[PDB]
């Protein structure tokens, strides 16, 4: 029934700034006896339980520092963080207390800023004893490149398909801020023998143009 | 203080039922509801349904009618719900909550429930070398790759775990019913290959430890 | 190879290192020291100096855990060393030495600061020890201004990766062992004075490196106008993306005029054109001001030599 929009996607601000999120209803979430927006936000550390912090679209929890302002009323509710630390990256959600269904929000996940960097490209061919026992796969590393924005593409000698291709993104690295990822190009033993070049091209804001490592077989 | 423990992970086959466990101690469980949230990477929370444990008992949602029935024991303080045709989206992690007038505020710890027919299979790992035909520019990176696995912990340490700096472990990806990753790892062009570099890949499920050097 | 090294005590006061007994003359016989060592990483260090080389500066002072601690600094090699005792007899315990003390790195390359370091144990300590073997050791790598600062690597953001081993595990006898730290993607910003810190729960020695940083310009010349009909004097000698913004003097000469190849160009030449990229680096166009070109000069072609740190001893030349 309620839709709860939230908004931004996913910032990334530096610690000490104020920050904010914004959040949407459907329907007006106000209650007329008892002047309260029965709206929550919740916090979730990465790889845990989340935990409520404001309740009511204000007040907030006993043990949550007072930088946590929630504010807004009607359909239009925001919560800002004046002073962000360490302790703060997490992802948020709004979620409504007013009808049934209960829904929450999209989530907005809060990153570190930093400085864009390009990534470490490097790519890999099949190993000897993955092609006597099974078939072949391209190994392509993007390591420590900011921001998140990446995509990668592949090229076999002029031709080019997305069949067999699996990525796997990481999340930000608790020491450096950086992102790394992975791409993997699993073929078989015999329609590998009958190409040539293998390419793994990328495309950040960095570089104007892409960073192409490739390799004869 | 009150505490919500829920059951282990559920690791099971599709089209067959599971029944997770929820107990509440620290406080009155018949005097305060009891909701389900669920968590599915890539959708967000999506809310269940509650349960009280005392007159008025179950409410479900518009999309959990037929699926996930809540049960709830008043003797000994425990929370129940019975998912039932478990197809391959119903993968998420399933959180017990104390509910409350403005929310919730008190949550479990969560149950992870993973739905799939594939056997218990050790994995394959192959060492990623860049190849005698490369530009090895001060750093040189290596891999050690591992498909072909099920489960989803395996642990992945490089020289017995010496080693951990610049070490980069991308998460499992699921494929042809196995799942599958990959390590990482930057060294110098002094230490390799002139100092070998092992990495060790152990599973708890299969219990089975491989240690392969990374060869040109 | 030098035989002994002359050194400053400090609390300064001359002494010597020796590495067969010499004539001790004006030296106090407490500074006139006839140096041991069982690692073997010191005298293999001055037996390894180029020769030729200048004498390289020492200081030793006293060490609380006798104790004298040996700073040796060179622009070839940084060696601090632990010691323990008419010459006194000294026997070498700890010693942390690098040969690459000042590195320079291109800019946006990765540096690679190396680092080696030898234990031997006194007798006291190995006779009192029932220690499996190797003990185990700590390395920091910090940033240091006239003192300390910021710790970057041990055992930390924009990288900074540490590694040390000894890969020897004898339990016997001196230990060696390895030591390296990389820089990824250096930037401006992190040129300085580095600290390399072993600690052992014997004891702390530190090493002192000068981390610089450079970068090559590009030179161009073209003649330039004025946006007019006739001519004012007006040239050009373009400098683009350096880093080292001190040691650059622009430069004119007249190659192949009617008097030799190394002719300076006369005239007007002024010099203020720069401006910042957005990478920290710089750029800068040279002008000249030459006189009307008579018969004798054809054939000639003039050009503008750029020095800098960045550059070789002749710099770069375009015409
Ligand atoms: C230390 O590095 C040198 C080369 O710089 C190498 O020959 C030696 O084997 C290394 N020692 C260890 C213990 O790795």
């Known amino acids: 029934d309620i839709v709860m929009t939230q908004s931004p996607s996913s910032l990334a601000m530096s610690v000490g700034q104020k920050v904010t999120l914004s959040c949407k209803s459907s329907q007006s979430l106000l209650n007329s006896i008892n002047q309260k927006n029965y709206l929550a936000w919740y916090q979730q550390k990465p790889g845990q339980s989340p935990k409520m912090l404001v309740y009511?679209?204000?007040t907030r929890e006993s043990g949550v520092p007072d930088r946590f302002i929630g504010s807004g009323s009607g359909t239009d509710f925001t919560l800002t963080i004046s002073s962000v630390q360490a302790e703060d990256l997490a992802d948020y959600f709004c979620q409504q207390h007013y009808s049934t269904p209960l829904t929450f929000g999209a989530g907005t996940k809060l990153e570190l800023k930093r400085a864009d960097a390009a990534p470490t490209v490097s790519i890999f061919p099949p190993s000897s004893e993955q092609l006597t026992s099974g078939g072949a796969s391209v190994v392509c590393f993007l390591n420590n490149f900011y921001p998140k924005d990446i995509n990668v593409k592949w090229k076999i000698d002029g031709s080019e398909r997305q069949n067999g291709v699996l990525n796997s993104w990481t999340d930000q690295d608790s020491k450096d801020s950086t992102y790394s990822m992975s791409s993997t190009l699993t073929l078989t033993k015999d329609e590998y023998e009958r190409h040539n070049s293998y390419t793994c091209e990328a495309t950040h804001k960095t570089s104007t143009s892409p960073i192409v490592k490739s390799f004869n077989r | 203080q009150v505490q919500l423990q829920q059951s282990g992970a559920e690791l099971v086959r599709p089209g067959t039922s599971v029944k997770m466990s929820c107990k509440a101690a620290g406080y009155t469980f018949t005097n305060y509801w009891i909701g389900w949230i669920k968590q599915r990477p890539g959708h967000g929370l999506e809310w269940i349904g509650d349960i009280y444990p005392g007159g008025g008992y179950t409410n479900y949602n518009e999309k959990f009618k037929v699926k996930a029935t809540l049960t709830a024991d008043t003797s000994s303080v425990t929370a129940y719900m019975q998912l039932s045709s478990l197809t391959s989206e119903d993968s998420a992690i399933y959180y017990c909550?104390?509910?409350?007038?403005?929310?919730?505020?008190?949550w479990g710890q969560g149950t992870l429930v993973t739905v799939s027919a594939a056997k218990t299979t050790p994995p394959s790992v192959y060492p990623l070398a860049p190849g005698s035909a490369a530009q090895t520019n001060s750093m040189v990176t290596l891999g050690c790759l591992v498909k072909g696995y099920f489960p989803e912990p395996v642990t992945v340490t490089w020289n017995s775990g010496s080693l951990s700096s610049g070490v980069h472990t991308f998460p499992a990806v699921l494929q042809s019913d196995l799942y599958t990753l990959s390590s990482s790892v930057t060294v110098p062009s002094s230490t390799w290959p002139s100092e070998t570099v092992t990495c060790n890949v152990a599973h708890p499920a299969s219990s089975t430890k491989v240690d392969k050097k990374i060869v040109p | 190879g030098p035989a002994v090294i002359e050194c400053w005590f400090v609390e300064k006061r001359p002494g010597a290192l020796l590495l067969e007994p010499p004539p001790r003359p004006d030296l106090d016989p407490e500074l006139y020291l006839s140096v041991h060592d069982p690692a073997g990483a010191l005298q293999a260090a001055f037996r390894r100096y180029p020769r030729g080389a200048p004498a390289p500066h020492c200081e030793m002072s006293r060490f609380v855990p006798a104790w004298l601690m040996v700073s040796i600094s060179s622009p070839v090699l940084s060696l601090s060393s632990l010691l323990r005792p008419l010459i006194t007899m000294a026997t070498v315990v700890l010693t942390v030495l690098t040969h690459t003390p000042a590195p320079r790195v291109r800019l946006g390359q990765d540096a690679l600061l190396d680092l080696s370091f030898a234990y031997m144990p006194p007798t006291s300590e190995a006779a009192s020890s029932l220690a499996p073997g190797p003990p185990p050791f700590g390395l920091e790598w910090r940033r240091q201004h006239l003192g300390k600062g910021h710790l970057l690597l041990a055992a930390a953001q924009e990288g900074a990766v540490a590694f040390a081993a000894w890969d020897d595990d004898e339990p016997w006898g001196p230990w060696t062992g390895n030591g390296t730290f990389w820089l990824p993607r250096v930037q401006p910003f992190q040129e300085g004075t580095y600290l390399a810190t072993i600690h052992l729960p014997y004891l702390q020695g530190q090493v002192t490196l000068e981390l610089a940083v450079y970068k090559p310009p590009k030179v161009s010349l073209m003649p330039a106008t004025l946006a007019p009909g006739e001519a004012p004097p007006e040239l050009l000698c373009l400098v683009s993306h350096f880093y080292p913004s001190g040691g650059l003097e622009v430069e004119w000469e007249l190659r192949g005029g009617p008097g030799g190849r190394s002719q300076k160009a006369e005239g007007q030449r002024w010099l203020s054109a720069l401006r910042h990229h957005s990478d920290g680096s710089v750029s800068l166009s040279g002008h000249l001001q030459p006189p009307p070109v008579t018969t004798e000069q054809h054939g000639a072609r003039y050009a503008c030599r750029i020095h800098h740190p960045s550059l070789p001893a002749s710099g770069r030349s375009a015409e």
């Open positions: 009511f679209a204000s």
């Open positions: 909550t104390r509910e409350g007038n403005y929310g919730f505020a008190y």
